[model samples]
Target: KVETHEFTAEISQLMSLIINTVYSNKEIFLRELISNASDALDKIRYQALSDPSQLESEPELFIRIIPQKDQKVLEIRDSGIGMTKADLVNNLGTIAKSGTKSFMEALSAGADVSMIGQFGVGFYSLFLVADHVQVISKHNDDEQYVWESNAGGKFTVTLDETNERLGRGTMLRLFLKEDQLEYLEEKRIKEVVKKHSEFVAYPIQLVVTKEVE
Candidate 1:
């Protein structure tokens, strides 16, 4: 079933803050995303330790960065515990469910402090650079689904039957902004990843080739 929803008041306000003021360093968006992926991979790994079947024949955990400058798109994909329909609705669609009041308090205290994922807002940070974002995910139990938004305070969720099966993981595609073209460069992405997420528990792969003259 295709569903469209508007952001909660808290989320709408949060989005405005993120795009307008909260993040002065836009590059940190990639770091927050990689951290979220690392956490997802960790979740499945921990689950497998208890129930080996959670591994589901795919044991390796990795993140892939695909930079398509010609297309003006950046993709961050991870082989980890993907989300279900409910997870998408609750995690991304809702506002401040991760502790809105606390997140607001933290920001009010000091917007300069690290705000990544503090209130489940890590994923939304993509809007800092990309005007549009797409999230494709497939979980072992739930069929693949796509969540899309233009950061206009509204988003839609739909069943994804066209894209190739992801097995068990998530892929985030960023439609880069004209001024944010640097983010589509392999070197820039590598530096950001190494700086902010160098010690990520899982390997982070830069799958794109360097730009040629």
Candidate 2:
């Protein structure tokens, strides 16, 4: 199904806080995305307990970061249980009905956001660096799908017909905004991962090519 969706009022307000006002450290974007990857991996393991078949094709798990300087894109990928189409909508669309509402209340009240994973609000932190975001994911029971948004109050989700299949995982591609290009450097990503997500469970790999002199 190919569809377009408008952001809920709460999400529009939250996005403004994340992208413009509240979050000052843009590098937190990587930390948040890696956290999401770790969560996705953890979920599949729980699902495997119910039906081991859920992991038949994707047993091993890891998070991969690819920064294409020329393309100005940062790709964060994880091998884990992915989301269905319904999930794409509910997870990213209806923040007002989820823990995100509490987060909104907290932020407005100047409450500490020490507890952030509840509503997946961290996912929207990608706007700190990306002008456009694309999520490609494959669930074991469903065909692959792609979700795209520009943090412009709306998003789109569609069946992915491309040759690229995630083999039962998810990959988020951030088309870096003009000034956010610093994230496309291995040195920066490596340092950020070490500082913030060093304790993350899965192996996280950052692709960097070396040139021989």
Candidate 3:
């Protein structure tokens, strides 16, 4: 059985492969993350139908994109099934659940590349453009936690107190890399949002830009 592994040294090489080559286009990182977010929201929304209180005050499904100029952070918020610290550590650190071997096998056997979410672990692409990534999340059955990592084989998980305003959901803040500064631009961010996420079931909006008129 493949167990979750610690952030081994190989992660650096894996990340380099993912960012530089696995994804050919720079903008596709956001697209892949948003797609995973959409899936999360779908899961939560479906569960809510069986238990309405699952989303007591929060909307059933939604995705918010906030770009901050002052801090150089790109925030992606979602009303999805958030994870606890253990879940965060296990899910974010290991490729055990990512189906790496299966993916390689499929690629070798010429499987459908477009249908790749068989294991649901692709959101790590956000780190491709961001130097550091932070996740503030709350699960319906657990206390909220903040998962912070630099993708450098180190991650921290702490009980969240600052973003308590967001009752039940996940908030991801990405500190943009120098080369990825384009994601910090309001117009550029919105264009990408429109291009990749407009058709999503829930709302996907940009929060930091305003009309010039």
Candidate 4:
């Protein structure tokens, strides 16, 4: 079945604060994406032990960077437990949770956010550098699909053309804005990966290429 999920009003407001304001540094995008990859790998490794057949293909943990030169799309693909449509909405369409909301409120109330993640607001970091974001995912329990957004209060989640996923995982593609071209270079991308996620518990690969839209 094909379905679409739209961001809630609160989700929109929260995203605006984080994407349009909170995270000022564009470089943080790399950290945020890699951090997510690490998290995904962890999830897959744990599940693989109980069900050997769970993995559709590779059982190893690693990440790859593929640049879509024809589309100027830089994607980070991983062999991990991919998200379903529900997971997408819960993880991407909301402010995270109640307790974290309180924490964020406290942070906004002058408490230090330096020590708190305060919900899954980290995903919105893509806007720091990307003009458009597309999430291609495949879940063991659900069909493969894509989730896309512009941080502009509108998002479209659709079924991906490629239904057969390479095992179970997600590929996050970033269409870097003109000002964010630094991400297209291998050196800068490598620096960010090595600095924040060198020991991320998974093999990370890099690819540098571009596409014109």
Candidate 5:
């Protein structure tokens, strides 16, 4: 069943702050996403260490960046731990429920760059460059699902019947804002990865292809 929910008052306030006042450099969004991807990869791989059966066949941990220039969409995908339906609602729909407050607390104390998503709003930062966001995720215990929003204080989550199973992981497709097309440039994306995510432990690959459109 599909579900829709409004952001809590705290998240409403947080969204306004992120879009209007926080984040001077829009490029920081990429770093935050990469950090979250790394965190998911760590969680699943770590969990699998105790129970190897939890992983799918050929469980290779990595991140993929696909840019659809013609459509002005940027897709960031990771072969890592993914969210369940309940996880989706709590993590993205609410405010500070998934360690977001802790992330901010650490940031206020001069936390290192390593602490990008100590709070949970890192995903919401996509609003800085994209008007709409679609998150498709698959977990071993849950069927594939899509969560979508425009950062307008509400989001919807529904079973993904159109797409193939992701096996296990998450994919974010960002419909870039008109003024943010610079993110479609391959060189620009590579530069951002080098500057902000180069230190990330997993291999990050850019999937440049004519079929992206």
Candidate 6:
């Protein structure tokens, strides 16, 4: 069953405001998203510190950026401690509701924008460069789930019906906005990664296809 819910009032406004901020550079979208992926990998490493079994299946910690340039879709993948459905709704669906409530409250108090990086800005920030976003994740303790939204009226979470399991991780697929498709270029991606996330602990792999004539 697909569960659909309206965005919370705070998140509704947050999504709108998130896109308007000084992101004129636009590449900040990739930085924030890649940073989020790094955080997920960190979470899994911390969890595995206590329970080693969690690493049995996918021991390699890495981040992958797959760009389907022709399709106008970009994917950010990470092998980390993935989220359950509730985690998705709690972490992503609501800003005034849970997890990031304090960040929301702080913003209301007119906190400086610099604080956003430490908080990693919510996945909603992806709205800056994409018209639609789909998050597919698998938690070791739960079956896989898919969360999709177009930054429109509502969002949905559904039990994935796909046969190929994700193993354990989260993959975010962003349908790039027309003007943002430049991110699909190999040189552009490398430049962004090199300039922004060069210090990330995990390996960031970019899938590239070279033409042969």
Clashing pairs in 1: none
Tens digit per residue, CA lDDT, model 1, 81-168: 9999888877886845556556767878775535757666677678788878889998878889999887677888999977667788
Question: Clashing residue pairs in candidate 3, if any?
Answer: none
Q: How many angstroms is residue 118 displaced in model 1 relative to the true structure, after the best TM-score fit?
A: 3.4
Better of 2 and 3 by lDDT: 2
lDDT of 5 by residue, 1-213 (tens): 778888776666555545553345788788888888999999899989999877773288889898988789999999888988888887776737446556556656876434445555677677778878899998878878999887678889999997656788999999998888989888999999999887888999998765465
CA lDDT of every candidate: 0.80, 0.81, 0.70, 0.71, 0.79, 0.80
User: Considering every candidate listed, which one attains the maximal lDDT?
Assistant: 2
Q: Please write out the lDDT profile of model 4 over residues 1-90, one tens digit for every residue.
A: 456566766666655655555444567666667777778878877787897777755666678877665666778888888898777766
Residue pairs in candidate 6 whose N, alpha carbon or C atoms collide under 3 angstroms: none
lDDT of 4: 0.71
Give the runs in model 5 whose Cα sits over 4 Å from its true position: 21-24, 95-120, 210-213
Q: How many pairs collide in each candidate, listed in order?
A: 0, 0, 0, 5, 2, 0
Per-residue lDDT of 67 in model 1: 87
Candidate 3, superposed: residue stretches over 4 Å from native? 1-5, 8-13, 19-24, 95-98, 101-119, 209-213
TM-score of each: 0.88, 0.89, 0.80, 0.82, 0.85, 0.87
Clashing pairs in 4: 69-210, 69-211, 70-211, 71-211, 72-211
> Runs in model 4 with CA error above 4 Å?
22-24, 95-118, 162-165, 209-213
**Deviation in Å, model 1, residue 102 alpha carbon:** 3.3
TM-score computed on alpha carbons, candidate 5: 0.85
For model 5 the local lDDT of residue 102 reads 60
Better of 3 and 6 by lDDT: 6
Candidate with the larger TM-score of 2 and 4: 2
